[PDB]
Structure formats: structure tokens, C-alpha cells
Amino acid sequence: YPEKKATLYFLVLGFLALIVGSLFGPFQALNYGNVDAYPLLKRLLPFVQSYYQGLTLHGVLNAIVFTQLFAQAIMVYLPARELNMRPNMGLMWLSWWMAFIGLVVAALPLLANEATVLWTFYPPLKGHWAFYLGASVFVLSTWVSIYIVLDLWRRWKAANPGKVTPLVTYMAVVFWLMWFLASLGLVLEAVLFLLPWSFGLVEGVDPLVARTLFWWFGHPIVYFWLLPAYAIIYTILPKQAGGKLVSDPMARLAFLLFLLLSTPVGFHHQFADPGIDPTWKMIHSVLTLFVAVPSLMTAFTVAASLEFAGRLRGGRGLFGWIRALPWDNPAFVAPVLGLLGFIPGGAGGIVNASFTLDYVVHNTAWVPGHFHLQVASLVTLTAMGSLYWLLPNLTGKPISDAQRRLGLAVVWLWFLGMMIMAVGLHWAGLLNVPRRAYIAQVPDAYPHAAVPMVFNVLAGIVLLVALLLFIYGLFPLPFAEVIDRRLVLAMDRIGFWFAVAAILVVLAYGPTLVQLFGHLNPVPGWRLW
């Protein structure tokens, strides 16, 4: 199996990216604890010129690079293994190399303080062409994954007319199709503006158009992060817990719904933008509340599976099933722990989405509090835990009891530290503390924040230990069994649902983008770092 080697390469590069980005984590957390440790960081890593270059690296490496690499590993290999078929190897290595080349190329300007824009890179803040070109080639790698998976699907569908798509593959097909749609937003932003602008071709870019296109791509990216964790949670975790998936139909419906609802929702990042018609912001508001539905459904489907495992293993009572679960298996613990923090995380989400309620929290410490529960915790934790089944399956190499225990330690410390940090930022944001801000540098600005600040420091240390330990550590697939055919058949009419998904985007962005393209106002770029 050459697909294992390709997959391992994707995972390894993703974890390197995780460690490097995460290095800035502790320092940032202390910063939100009003403690300034950047002199110490600058001594260690002398190329770092500022908190903000640090913030760029953190965000790009952790939230773009690791998460993407993790998706391309999981959401190619897993379907390939379900089908028992080979991926096109030439393409698979092509994908890897684009990822790897685009990464190197963006890394240059990034390391050289030439692109300190954040992971969002909002014009007129003007970065080095190599950042945009490198980031572009980075993301486009996925277009190759999309193809590969569609290829596998079709080849199997040929061998097997009149059979429903198997589950994992179904998941990945709706996932990758969803991503093709979402990705266009960025492709459009890079090609029509970012690249031309950064190479010196046009003299300005219109900030409102760039944000609109950005956020077409910017929301479904988070679902693109989550869904790989989900696939595992649904089709692997249940075996890990000693149970079984409780509904294959319900899982398909979850995923189907993400395909329909992941992209047409972007204005929920733009409730505070001028020049978007408020009626549109309401529309995207409802559509966003809609997109919470598949998660609400996932909360139930999954809990039911865990309870089921718990009763099988002989836990009785209302809480008995909980203590019967295998709390000794890090591959089970990590995703469940992340599920728990996903409760208040999604709660914050539903808050952010409600149009006016976003004015309370927009651009405060609240947002980072919300999303560290989402991606930094549930996704990352799920990734960390797969190591304990995914490595052996890929490498031949077995996990010792020692390595097992050190894994339990890391996941717990990472979870707890994340939960503590989430209390700090949510609370700090309720007190009006801004996000993306070297606040420790204005020590007397936010005195009312003294308490949540203690949480932030604590978390920095807890998360530093966990990172340190994770580093020190880093140096058949357990697919679960399942416990209404017609619904299943409806959900298998993929081109149809794909079509619908596309219409929903045209409908949600068309009127506003046409309006904006008719009235462009490009403005000169700036480097204020």
C-alpha cells in the first residue's frame, strides 16, 4: 500500500506545522493574561519582529496548514480503505508536493516579516506576492484531492451500479464537493485581486469586495476543518468506545446538510461591514442558524452511540454508562473531550450568528474563546488521538503503554488548558477586550479584566506543558459497525444535491456581488508592520 506513505507524509507535515504554530500559543495566552513574554521569545527566535508576525504564523500554520493537511490525509485515505481501492498515486504525490511547495514559498515572506497580515490578509494591508502565491498553490492542492476522491467514487460506482454509496465515501464525496464550491471564493479573490495587486499590476483593491469573496471561502473552511473529525467520530469512535454507530442514515443526513448549508452563510462574518444590505445579513443569519442543525443532530446521534457502548460494557444508571467507557484509550478520550468543549463552543457560535447579538462580541476576546473550543480543541484533539490508531495502521509500528499514558496526559492537559483559556477569553470579551491585540503592552488599559486575565495566564502555562509533552512524545482501520432505505436513496442522488448547493450560493452571493462589482473602489495598499 503506497497510499499509506502518501498519507503519512500529509499527517507528518501537518503536525510539524502544528508544533511550530503552537509555539506562539503560550506567549499569546500570557499576553491576554497581561503578562509580556516577547523579550524572552525574541531571544529564542530572533527572526520574530513582533507579536503580530507571531500572530500571523500561529494562525496560518495552525488553522490553514495543519487542518488542511489533516483533511487531505483523512478524507482521502479513509474512503480508499473503506472501498479497498487504490488512489491515483501520481495525483496523490502531486497534491502533496503542491502543499509542500506552496508552504515553503509562503513561509519565506512570512519568516522575513514581509507578510504580517493575519490569516485573513485583509486589504489594504499589503503582503508580499510570495505569501499570496504560496497560499494559493497551497489551497489549490485540495482541487487534486477532490478529483482523486471523485475518481475513486466513480470507479467503484462503475463496478457497482444500483448500490448505494458506502458511508465514509459518501461522507468524503459530499465533503469534497462542498469544498470545491467554498474554495471558489478564494480562487476568485486571489486571481481577480490579490495576485494582480501584489505583483504590481493594479494599484488598488476594493476592501469590501475582498472581504466578501474572502468570507465566501472563509466560513466553509471551518467545516472543512471539522468534517474530518466528524467522519472519525461517526465511523471510528463508536468502535473505540466499545459500541456501534447508531444510524447510518442520520450521519449521511448530517453530512448532506453541511453540503447544502456550508457556503451561503458568509455575511455572518460581515454583520459589521458597511455596504451590505441588512436584509441580506438577516438572510445569512437564518441560513447560519440552519447550519447548526447538522451539529445538533450530530450531538444526539453521537451521544446515543456512546451511551450504547456504555451499556454494552455494563454501565447502568443515568451516568453509569459514562464510567463504563474506555477512559484508558487516548484514541477515545481525545474526541470525547473535544465533544464536551464543543458544547459551549457551539453555544457561542449560535450567539455569534444572531445578527444583532454579534455587535456585543464582534472582534473581542470572545471570538477566539469560541473558536479555540472548535478547532483548537475538538478538531486538534481528534487529530491527536487518531495518532494512536492511525500511526500503527500506517507505519507498522506499535504504541507502548508508556506512550499510551503520555498520550492520555497530553490530551487531558490540552483539553483542560483549552477550557481554562476559553473561560478567560469569553469573559475578557464580555468586558470589551479586543481580539488580535498585544494588550500586555498597554498594561493599564483593561483593569476590569484582572480576573479573566488570571485564567489566561494559567492556561498559557498548562498549554505550554502540554505542547512540550506533545513534542517530547512525537519524537485494519477500526471502522465501527452500524446497529429507511428510501431516504438513503434520496441522499445518494449526488449531482442533484450538488446542483442545489450551487444554486444556493448563486442565490446568497449573486445579488450582493453583482451590486459590488458594479461600483468597485480600489484603494492603495499599506505595510504598517
Binding site: 444510524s247 442520520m250 458597511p274 441588512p278 444526539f300 455587535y359 498585544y438
Partner: protein, 166 residues
């Protein structure tokens, strides 16, 4: 055993899906409500109103900060705030309590946050556009303005002030 559990879970899952759907819908209704009150004034007017950032500090309403606060109705003031690296003009913004204040905010450089601490005023400022938002001050005194969008290295120290006269 297994046939029974599957029937029961689905049976209960259908119910939860109905409940949560209604919860969401109630939230939708509760947002629709906010939309009809004065409190919705802080949502940006959805109107495109282009301006040229290279001259906005040299001609037009933003170029004389001391004349930026204009009475536009019997109980209404418009204020032409400029948000720049790294501060606001005017400093301070003086306005009367209980009057409707239409803030017309633009930038001459890079995007900025305009977030009035203690209030729902929380709007992005884009170079090239005017962000228009309305608010009535209910308590006299000093409110602070925080930049909540990363604007470069002076970001963390970018503050402004509004004074609401008794």
C-alpha cells in the same frame, strides 16, 4: 435488544430534532424583534457611499475635525469620524445626551474597528467606504473608543474618546 434500542433512539432523536428546530426558530423571532427597535440603529446602513482615502484628509467633511459634529435635525447630530493609524478625529467627539447620533466613519489607510465601550456601537471602517451607524446616548460622561481590527503595530494603543454632555 438491538432492534429495540435502534427504534427508541430514533424515536427520541426525531423529538430532539423537533425541539431544537423550534429553539432556533424562537431565536429567529427574537432577532426579528431586535430589528424593529431603536437598538438596531447600530447595524450599518446597507448603502454604498464611496470616497477617496487619499484626499479625505484634505477636502470634504472629514478635513476639519472641529467642525465634524453637525446638527442635522431638531434632535439629531451627524459626526464625521476619521479612523486612522493610529487614532481618531475628532478627539474627543462631543455629543449631547438623548440626541440621535449618526456616525459616518471612514479610513484613509487601512481597515479599523470602531467599538464604543459600553455600547452596541461596533462597526468596521473601510478605506473607500463610509460606515453609517446610529445610536442615542442614554448616560452622560466619557466613553472610550477601541480599535478592534488589526491595523498594524500601533493597533493595541489605538483609542479614542466620546464625551456625552449632561
Amino acid at each position: 435488544d438491538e432492534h429495540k434500542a435502534h427504534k427508541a433512539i430514533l424515536a427520541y432523536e426525531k423529538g430532539w430534532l423537533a425541539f431544537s428546530l423550534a429553539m432556533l426558530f424562537v431565536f429567529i423571532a427574537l432577532i426579528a424583534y431586535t430589528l424593529a427597535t431603536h437598538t438596531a440603529g447600530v447595524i450599518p446602513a446597507g448603502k454604498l457611499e464611496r470616497v477617496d482615502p487619499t484626499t479625505v484628509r484634505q477636502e470634504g467633511p472629514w478635513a476639519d475635525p472641529a467642525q465634524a459634529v453637525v446638527q442635522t435635525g431638531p434632535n439629531q447630530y451627524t459626526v464625521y469620524v476619521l479612523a486612522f493609524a493610529f487614532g481618531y478625529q475628532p478627539n474627543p467627539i462631543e455629543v449631547p445626551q438623548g440626541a440621535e447620533i449618526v456616525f459616518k466613519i471612514t479610513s484613509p489607510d487601512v481597515i479599523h474597528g470602531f467599538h464604543v465601550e459600553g455600547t452596541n456601537i461596533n462597526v468596521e471602517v473601510l478605506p473607500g467606504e463610509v460606515s453609517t451607524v446610529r445610536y442615542t446616548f442614554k448616560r452622560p460622561g466619557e466613553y472610550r473608543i477601541i480599535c478592534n481590527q488589526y491595523c498594524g503595530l500601533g493597533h493595541q494603543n489605538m483609542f479614542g474618546t466620546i464625551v456625552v454632555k449632561e
